[PDB]
């Protein structure tokens, strides 16, 4: 159906057949059994033209999937800086959290990307927020060896 | 298709089901 189709174009890069796919009637808004959603796997795999085309078209910027995980936590946690940018000018919520209590800046934290760490802090993440797991951003920075993240959520926290 | 259990459980089970169709 135009919805799977959608969903393979988006994780696969296809520019012109997302196009293609929402001209010919395609829901933006397209889920899989997971709740994955185009926008989460073109987030998830750096796609940021599709992203744009996506969120242009009435993409859900706040869509979640069977584990609470929005878009905004999938380029945070992969490294896209840009796409992390577009999605909160789009209206991301910047302290969603998943099913582990992890928001976006713990995701950040966790997988080391300084420089979405610093883009969530200045639109207005929680630096105190606590995952299930009793860990802050700045705990699984340290856990991690990520010296950079933790001393800027440090400062952040001061 | 390891099982992360604690901080980062929800995202890697998402990432690694984005990993199936991807």
Do not use: C
């Amino acid at each position: 159906d135009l919805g799977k189709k959608l969903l393979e174009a988006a994780v696969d890069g296809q520019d012109d057949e997302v196009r293609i796919l929402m001209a010919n009637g395609a829901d933006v808004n397209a889920a899989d059994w997971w709740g994955l959603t185009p926008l989460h796997l073109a987030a998830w795999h750096g796609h940021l033209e599709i992203v744009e085309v996506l969120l242009k078209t009435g993409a859900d910027v706040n869509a979640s999937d069977n584990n609470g995980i929005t878009p905004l936590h999938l380029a945070a946690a992969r490294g896209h800086l840009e796409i992390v940018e577009v999605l909160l000018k789009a209206g991301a919520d910047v302290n969603a959290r998943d099913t582990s209590g992890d928001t976006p800046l713990h995701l950040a934290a966790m997988q080391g990307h300084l420089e979405i760490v610093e883009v969530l802090l200045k639109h207005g993440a929680d630096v105190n927020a606590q995952d299930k797991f009793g860990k802050t951003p700045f705990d699984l920075a340290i856990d991690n060896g990520n010296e950079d993240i933790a001393e800027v959520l440090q400062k952040a926290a001061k | 298709k390891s099982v992360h259990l604690g901080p980062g459980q929800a995202f890697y089970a998402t990432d690694g089901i984005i990993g199936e169709i991807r």
